[PDB]
């Protein structure tokens, strides 16, 4: 890979009439997938990260919003980043989005981190747009290459032994962090079980304990579940994504859990802000929110 050339081309569309594509060659994109897979597999499936860093939720192919996030947060490696999954689907430029993220992972592997979301799954992104985008601009074989890459993404992260991060939420199957560590990669996301729950579950204020999730996949969990999880694992905060929230961030269970969502005006249907959470060296958390405007 010539990673510098790739990043330069991805970044040079800044300020262009939004919607403008970057057409990397097929072999460069394949290259990003192959090299990032190597990096993902060589690093832990449960990341151990140190603050300061910036944490973002769902991007969903909103490439020009991703560029704005970097403009406000600082371009790598000026700031460290942890993304919480859902890079593709339901947006207009998933290819550019995932290519820039993989490129940054390759260039700054210890300053830049990506977790797996429920859309980083062939069965989901075949339907919700990514497959169609790949087919239109390249071919099926490239989409399949992406799936092999996604199957190797890490699943969760712990920041300074105090903040537990994952895309979806908790699992009633989860008793020790070691269970996450013993998940072998590459793997698909199962229709049920621990890995499914980590990518699909949701907090719910009206559930006591665990409940069946209205989505029809995985579970909901209540505030006392969060409290017991934190107490058991000596943690202060759960940081997750996976739900559109009006201000881009939303607290649950007296600030013991936070939901982050980083795609403003998602699907052009919600009028939600996108948020980015900064965690300083002392673990003070602050929020920057991108509010959509006419």
């Amino acid at each position: 890979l010539n990673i510098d050339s790739i990043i330069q081309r991805l970044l040079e569309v800044r300020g262009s009439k939004p919607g403008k594509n970057v057409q990397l060659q097929e072999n460069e994109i394949r290259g990003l997938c192959l090299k990032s897979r190597e990096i993902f597999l060589s690093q832990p499936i449960l990341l151990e990260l140190e603050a300061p860093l910036k944490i973002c939720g769902d991007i969903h192919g909103q490439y020009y919003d991703l560029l704005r996030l970097f403009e406000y947060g600082g371009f790598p490696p000026e700031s460290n980043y942890l993304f919480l999954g859902d890079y593709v689907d339901r947006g207009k430029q998933s290819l550019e989005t995932i290519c820039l993220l993989l490129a940054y992972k390759i260039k700054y592997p210890e300053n830049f981190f990506l977790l797996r979301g429920n859309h980083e799954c062939a069965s989901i992104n075949r339907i919700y747009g990514f497959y169609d985008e790949c087919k239109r601009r390249y071919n099926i074989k490239l989409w399949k290459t992406f799936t092999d890459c996604f199957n190797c993404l890490p699943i969760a992260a712990i920041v300074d032994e105090k903040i537990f991060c994952c895309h979806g939420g908790l699992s009633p199957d989860l008793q020790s962090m070691e269970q996450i560590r013993r998940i072998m990669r590459p793997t698909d996301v199962p229709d049920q079980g621990l890995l499914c729950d980590l990518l699909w579950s949701d907090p719910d204020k009206d559930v006591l304990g665990w409940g069946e999730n209205d989505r029809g996949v995985s579970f909901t969990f209540g505030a006392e579940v969060v409290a017991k999880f934190l107490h058991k694992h000596d943690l202060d905060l759960i940081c997750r994504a996976h739900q559109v929230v009006e201000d881009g961030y939303e607290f649950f269970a007296k600030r013991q859990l936070v939901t982050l969502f980083s795609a403003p005006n998602y699907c052009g249907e919600f009028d939600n802000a996108g948020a980015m959470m900064s965690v300083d060296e002392t673990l003070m958390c602050s929020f920057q929110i991108l509010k959509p405007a006419e």
Binding site: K92, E161, K162, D271, T282, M284, S286, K291
Partner: peptide, 20 residues
């Protein structure tokens, strides 16, 4: 170390994000 939260949120407005 202990997680704490800054009360002050920084807000930005992104023109063009309605009706992309």
């Amino acid at each position: 170390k202990k997680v704490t939260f800054l009360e002050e949120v920084t807000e930005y407005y992104i023109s063009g994000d309605e009706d992309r």
